[PDB]
Amino acid sequence: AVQKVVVHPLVLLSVVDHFNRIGKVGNQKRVVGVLLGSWQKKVLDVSNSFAVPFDEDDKDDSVWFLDHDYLENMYGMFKKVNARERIVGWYHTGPKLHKNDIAINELMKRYCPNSVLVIIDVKPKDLGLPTEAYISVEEVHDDGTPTSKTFEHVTSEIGAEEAEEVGVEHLLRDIKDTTVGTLSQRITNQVHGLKGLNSKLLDIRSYLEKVATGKLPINHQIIYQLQDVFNLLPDVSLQEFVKAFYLKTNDQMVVVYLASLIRSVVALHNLINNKIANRDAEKKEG
């Protein structure tokens, strides 16, 4: 079923433009819409989406309204102008999930069995990653209830397409591709280190909050079971890579000998050209 996708930011501006439709007139403040998807491979693909006129109330939080002419025959007009594009799922804002999610899940599964919805953000100043993807399966529980359609998560990703940045990257002008060595990786350093260990500070903080008052992750024991996958390295009180003592010595070995030899040859590049070119063009006095 759905594992990873290919999503192009035309859906993203197709979120932001309906956000422009309902922002200044803001009464129900939310952009919820339908994700058309050119379902090609096990990897998914989107090149179109539309936002349904929609509301969602708070009391009993299951009142919600599609527009089935706008849902059926607009999709039919779309199928006429593009039969390759068909339905694959939907999207919404308000990243806090709620109870009506499973109801629009019930209706999104009858259009496509392996459907997937998209939690968005209207202002990602994130780490970051873009918007979300789920997968709706039935695992029911260890509880014995009638069918639990709890939202399982698909790892979301982004693809690409020819000729779709032509004016936009022209407008930004701040494009800097080939500079890895000063900045493009230290951003990732700051990002994965700080932003991963602060998500891990949310892990210790949230799960010690579960220790205090919370779930205390029993019966999803994959939490600490997977912290064991973290605990491949225990690092006990001498930090325990004194077996990697000589291994790290042999790792420092190769690259630092590359450093010494190669950068001496890099000097032999730089200095000779600099001195000869400068002495020529300097002693030519006119």
């Binding site: 230290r186 220790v211 912290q227 973290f230 325990e240």
Partner: protein
């Protein structure tokens, strides 16, 4: 056991395992064939070697390991990432 001892003795094996000194090789090679651990044992001195394993919780609600390793590691790589920034302060320039 509070690791950093992973290559170790055999009498604790022959004591807790309720097995003898001799029958630890059957023990380790059959336990590798089972598939809960995959480390090739240093067999010349009956010295254990281990890999991935399945956990049964740490300190009573995982206080101690979580704090003193996870958050210690958090502030380790976080603050030394700040040190990476500190020496890489204006190499972005």
């Amino acid at each position: 056991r509070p690791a950093n001892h992973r290559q170790l003795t055999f009498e604790e094996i022959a004591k807790s395992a309720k097995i003898t000194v001799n029958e630890v090789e059957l023990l380790v090679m059959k336990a590798l064939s089972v598939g809960l651990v995959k480390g090739s044992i240093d067999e010349v001195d009956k010295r254990v070697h281990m890999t991935w394993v399945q956990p049964r919780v740490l300190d009573l609600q995982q206080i101690k390991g979580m704090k003193d390793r996870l958050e210690f590691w958090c502030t380790d790589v976080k603050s030394m990432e700040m040190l990476v920034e500190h020496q890489a302060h204006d190499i972005l320039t």
